């Protein structure tokens, strides 16, 4: 579950926090995919 | 949840605008691994062997023989939870505070929740980057009045048992003197069998300015940066050398390998700012909110980081 | 909301048991016009036109023609948000106090939310009427310990740049002297082209008592009505008595072109969403209201003050 | 409600594990009848009738007849509401405190809500049983710093206008003297027309251990308990006699009938521990909850409780 | 309305408290039924 | 402490505390040594009645 997919529906604040963490990790991965040294 | 919690909905709709941390550039994708923990510690056990004396010559009869000893070390990484509070306008009261082209009271510096959260998160991410680079938490340019952190919580610049070189105060203008200290530290580095890895260099803006001058009559083709890249390539076996400039540094040069076997960053999965469920509400238009974040999780081997400090006296 | 929040439902069901404010009797229906604000200032712009010269006769060929100009004026009105807190019984705890013939602790003077809200709203409405008539906020009969209000916040009595007449202390009991001051003020009133309007007079109880004595078979009240009818083109003159005034006389037109009341639409008491709760049976609620919005033209209100000493 | 209020849901899930009060064994099923009140007083009215003269013989024509009168009595019972607060872990934080075979913070003495509630409820129920037996509220073994209670609030041991016998200190180990006092009190019991009813005795453990002795030269085939049961049967018309041991007592013997016409317990329906809706929250992982209970409601007739106290000084 | 049953679904805290009281009463009655002096 | 009477307004309430105890059981390893005859030496001590010195 991530905030990148709008189809995600958080049921409670716990799932909301987990989704935030997953979104941060996914953006980290995307940044390294788009990084070109 | 989003049908009941406007603040949660606003955070979900605003989280995209918050920019990525710049510390990701200082590491490789294989050097960052998340750990599921807010506050606490993680342990790692490493075994080692050593020779207690010269070997024994086996001739005729002898039963007193030199011994080989063993040792175990436990490396502990601490993770600490931190929080900030900020004030904002209440959602029901935002209508009376909207204006022609903006929402918020300029006279009292009151903001809508989304904008306040975004700005606070940006500031907290700046603080996190400063911690990861230097290993200290402070809000003063002097660097005093620091927060007392737990032991075994270090950054790239204050990690103990690493190579440290100091350029004298009277030699701060001499780039050749600086390069002499850098070369001495590079020689003293001990990468072992994991030497073949890309290397990372972080410099201050002034040093970046000094690096573009021609190598020393002066050479007409090569610069000090090119000489530095060749020198580091000599010890990393002609692997890539990446150079970065950070305004956070002041007259300090950091050189370290981008190898997960030597340096590994295991941050908490809750390290980056996260909203708290508690919201303070009164009969007025002002409300308060809280942001949580976790610090800690840098692991390095001994004598794998070169730290060059140029005295400015 | 009416299933989740009980207090909102109670306010909805009991909001119809609060009587209308008596300040409505001092204005014509056309004079009151709400605005959408809670606190701050709102600017009102009045546009006017004027003739620059005599009109031009259109005969044969003409190019140079008399012009009509325009003018503007900006008036700033301030509004202030005020609040009260009151204690009441919790909804889940009402059943342990629902006695016969009454609900609530008589010994502790603790009420259910609906009744407490109704009573508090009535008191706040009385305070609002006092402000509208006088322009001051106080809870003492002497009028001392006044709350300091913002500028550009005036009532019918303290409105600046109006006609002020003062009756001396030695003539406090001389209706002829009081009437002389009233005639002087009525002469100094400037209504212009809007003089054909009904007029309103507000008096204190003592002056009301003195207005029924024989004129020195005619009454001072009849003489005053005739005097005002001499200037308002023989139209209605209404006379009201108020206990909020003390040795004061107020005369003003009931015309929306000269005096206009522009209250905030949240002026009357409104419950606040915040409710203070704890582990006991007592809870606290808040009521908000907004003050301000009176607008008038210069020299259209006559204020007569009878000095007592 | 259960979809929203997790604390209510957990209380519902764990309410079963709380054990029944021990005071239920001190009363017959008919003697306990609940009332709907939390704090305040409730009046009970009892009506009696009496004969004014001898009956009239109905023969031929008679107009003047003997009359029957009526009278009433009113008794007032006070009830008191009491509350406790306890700390616990926030529901959304237990995942960071779960362990291999337990949940909670041992170093900080923090538990999940369900376990904390169960333990607190058990302690409160023990306090309620102590009050019901003794009529006093205190948390000290010395019985000092007692909470001041309302009048018309009594227990089985401090009920006024009952029979009270005292055994002297020199006779503290003489069951013959103890039975002398017991029989004197049993003679002074006034049950009226309700004497044909089962009787109940409550003794302390030391007294029970003295009762299990052979009857006293020492005899055979008969115990002191048998002697006591026969003596009580003498006054209750050969009805049932029950004996109970309670560590709450101390050098005390309490004898009373199990008849709802003489002693009736009318407790509030909210006497046993009940959660409060208010839950204190914060920006940390620590929350607070509240438990309510109601005391009072013991009604008795005069001179129907025998209390024998053995002195030690 | 008792907490022993699963068919009962409280709608509010007042109903939940009444259910707790009824559950206590039912447990007392069951204890007296199972009691054997 | 003693419970708190709920009447009128009050927010200072008596508390119920909790404690945790860790019970620990220790185990110790002990050893004895004893002398005896070697296996192959028994036949030189096998008397008719018994075996041993």
d(CA D248, CA B179): 86
d(CA B226, CA D189): 113
Q: How far does the CA of residue A22 sit from the closest CA of chain D (Å)? A: 17
Degrees to nearest 5, angle at CA D156 with D152 and D161: 65
- What one-character-per-residue DSSP string does C251-269 give? EEE--TTTEEE--BTT-S-
From the list B37, B39, B278, the residue facing D282 with the nearest CB is: B278
Q: How far does the CA of residue E36 sit from the closest CA of chain D (Å)? A: 10
Q: Is the Cβ of D282 closer than 8 Å to some Cβ of chain B?
A: yes
What sign for the dihedral angle of Cα D29, D30, D31, D33? positive
Residues 6+ apart with CB under 8 A from E13: C92, D1, D5, D8, D277
Residues 6+ apart with CB under 8 A from D15: E3, E20, E23
The C-alpha R_g of chain A, in whole angstroms, comes to 12
Q: Which 247-306 residues of chain D touch chain E by CB within 8 A?
A: 269-270, 272, 274-275, 277
Q: How far does the CA of residue A25 sit from the closest CA of chain B (Å)? A: 8
d(CA C30, CA C256): 6
CB contact under 8 A, D276 and C279: yes
Tell me how many residue pairs between chain A and chain D have CB atoms under 8 A apart.
Answer: 3
Q: Is the Cβ of F16 closer than 8 Å to some Cβ of chain C?
A: no
Q: For residue B54, give the DSSP letter.
A: P
> Which positions in chain D touch E19 (Cβ < 8 Å)?
12
In sequence order, the β-bridge partners of residue B72 are B47
Report CA-CA distances (Å) from D71 to C64, D45, D53, D74, D301.
Answer: 115, 10, 16, 11, 17
Q: Give residue B296's region: left, alpha or beta (phi > 0; psi -120 to 50).
A: left
Q: How many CB atoms lie within 10 A of CB B66?
A: 10
Check: CB of residue C186 under 8 Å from CB of residue C180. Answer: no
**How does C260-281 read in b/e, with b if 16+ C-beta sit within 10 Å?**
bbbbbebbbbbbbeebeebbbb
Tally of CA atoms within 13 A in the half-sphere of B170 that contains its CB: 0
Three-state secondary structure along chain D?
Answer: CCCCCHHHHHHHHHHHHCCCCHHHHHCCHHHECCECCCCEEEEEEEEEEEECCCCCCCCCCCCCCCCEEEEEEEEEEEEEEEEEEEEEECHHHHHHCECCCCECECCCCECCHHHHHHHHHHHHHHHHHHHHHHCCCCCCCCCCCCCCCCCCCCCCCCCCCCEEEEECHHHCCCHHHHHHHHHHHHHHCCCCCCCCCCEEEEECHHHHHHHCCECCCCCCCCEHHHHHHHHHHHHHCCCCEEEEECCCCCCEEEEEECCCCCEEECCECCCCCEECCCCECCCCCEEEEEEEEEECCEEECCCCCEEEEECCC
Q: Is the Cβ of D37 closer than 8 Å to some Cβ of chain C?
A: yes
CB contact under 8 A, A28 and B2: no
d(CA B190, CA C171): 109
d(CA B96, CA C267): 15
Degrees to nearest 5, angle at CA E7 with E5 and E8: 80
d(CA C232, CA C198): 7
Phi, psi at B219, each rounded to 5°: -70, 150
Three-state secondary structure call for residue F10:
coil
Q: From the candidates B274, B289, B290, which should be mutated to test the interface with A, based on the most A CB atoms within 10 A?
A: B274
Phi, psi at B102, each rounded to 5°: -155, 160
Residue among C30, C78, C31, C69 nearest C47 (CA): C69
Chains E and B touch (3+ CB pairs under 8 A): no
Q: Which contiguous run of DSSP H or E holds residue B280?
A: strand B280-281
Q: Work out the angle between the directed axes of helices D113-134 and D6-14 (0-180°, nearest 10).
A: 60
Residues 6+ apart with CB under 8 A from B75: B43, B44, B46, B152, B299
d(CA C270, CA C287): 6
Structure token digits, residue D170: 């020199």
Q: Resolution, in Å, please? A: 2.7
Three-state secondary structure call for residue B38:
coil
What sign for the dihedral angle of Cα A15, A16, A17, A21? positive
d(CA C40, CA C37): 7
Phi, psi at C203, each rounded to 5°: -130, 160
In sequence order, the β-bridge partners of residue B32 are B265
Residues 6+ apart with CB under 8 A from B210: B175, B178, B224
Degrees to nearest 5, angle at CA B166 with B163 and B170: 165
**How does C188-215 read in b/e, with b if 16+ C-beta sit within 10 Å?**
ebebeeebebebbbbbbebbbebbeeee
d(CA E7, CA E18): 15
Structure token digits, residue B69: 């000893």
Report CA-CA distances (Å) from B7 to A21, A23, B274.
Answer: 17, 18, 12
- Name all chains with 3 or more CB-CB pairs below 8 Å to chain B: A, C, D
In sequence order, the β-bridge partners of residue C253 are C199
Phi, psi at C165, each rounded to 5°: -115, 140
From the list F5, F16, F20, the residue facing D82 with the nearest CB is: F5
Phi, psi at B197, each rounded to 5°: -155, 150
In chain C, the N- to C-terminal Cα span, in Å, equals 59
CB contact under 8 A, B242 and A25: no
Q: Is the Cβ of C92 closer than 8 Å to some Cβ of chain D?
A: yes
Report CA-CA distances (Å) from D134 to D56, D245, D246.
Answer: 52, 14, 12
Q: Is the Cβ of D83 closer than 8 Å to some Cβ of chain C?
A: yes
Q: Can you tell me which residue has the tokens 């009952």?
A: D162
Report CA-CA distances (Å) from B103 to B53, C37, C264, D152.
Answer: 76, 15, 21, 64
Q: How many CB atoms lie within 10 A of CB C90?
A: 21
In sequence order, the β-bridge partners of residue D255 are D201, D306
d(CA B231, CA B211): 14
Residue among B48, F18, A36, C235 nearest D106 (CA): F18
CB contact under 8 A, F10 and C280: yes
d(CA D254, CA D156): 8
Check: CB of residue B112 under 8 Å from CB of residue B289. Answer: no
Q: Is the Cβ of B105 closer than 8 Å to some Cβ of chain C?
A: no
Q: Can you tell me which residue has the tokens 């002795």?
A: D213
d(CA C271, CA C275): 10
Structure token digits, residue C224: 């005053």
Structure token digits, residue D182: 């017991």
Three-state secondary structure call for residue B159:
coil
Check: CB of residue B171 under 8 Å from CB of residue B181. Answer: no
Chains F and D touch (3+ CB pairs under 8 A): yes
Q: Which 107-136 residues of chain B touch chain C by CB within 8 A?
A: none
């Amino acid at each position: 579950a991530s905030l990148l997919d709008s189809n995600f529906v958080p049921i409670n604040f716990t799932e909301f926090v987990q989704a935030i963490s997953n979104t941060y990790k996914q953006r980290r991965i995307q940044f390294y995919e788009n990084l070109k040294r | 949840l989003f049908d009941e919690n406007y603040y949660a909905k606003a955070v979900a709709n605003i989280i995209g605008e918050v920019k990525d941390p710049i510390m990701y550039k200082w590491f490789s994708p294989d050097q960052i691994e998340d750990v599921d923990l807010q506050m606490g510690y993680q342990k790692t056990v490493k075994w080692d062997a050593f020779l207690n004396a010269n070997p024994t010559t086996i001739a005729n009869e002898v039963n007193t023989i030199s011994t080989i000893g063993f040792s175990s070390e436990v490396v502990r990484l601490n993770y600490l939870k931190l929080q900030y509070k900020f004030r904002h306008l209440k959602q029901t009261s935002e209508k009376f505070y909207t204006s022609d082209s903006y929402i918020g009271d300029i006279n009292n510096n009151l903001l809508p929740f989304a904008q306040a959260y975004k700005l606070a998160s940006s500031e907290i991410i700046k603080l996190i980057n400063h911690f990861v680079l230097t290993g200290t938490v402070s809000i003063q340019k002097d660097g005093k009045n620091q927060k007392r952190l737990l032991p075994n919580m270090y950054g790239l610049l204050n990690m103990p048992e690493q190579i440290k070189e100091e350029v004298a105060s009277g030699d701060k203008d001499k780039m050749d003197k600086i390069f002499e200290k850098i070369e001495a530290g590079l020689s003293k580095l001990e990468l072992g069998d994991e030497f073949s890895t890309p290397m990372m260099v972080i410099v201050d803006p002034a040093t970046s300015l000094k690096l573009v001058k021609p190598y020393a009559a002066a050479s007409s083709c090569e610069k000090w940066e090119d000489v530095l890249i060749q020198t580091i390539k000599a010890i990393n076996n002609r692997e890539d050398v990446y150079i970065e400039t950070s305004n956070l540094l002041k007259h300090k040069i950091l050189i370290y390998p981008l190898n997960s076997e030597l340096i590994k960053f295991k941050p908490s999965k809750y390290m980056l700012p996260t909203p708290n469920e508690q919201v303070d509400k009164d009969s007025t238009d002002v409300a308060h909110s809280y942001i949580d974040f976790v610090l800690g999780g840098l692991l390095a081997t001994r004598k794998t980081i070169l730290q060059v400090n140029i005295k400015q006296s």
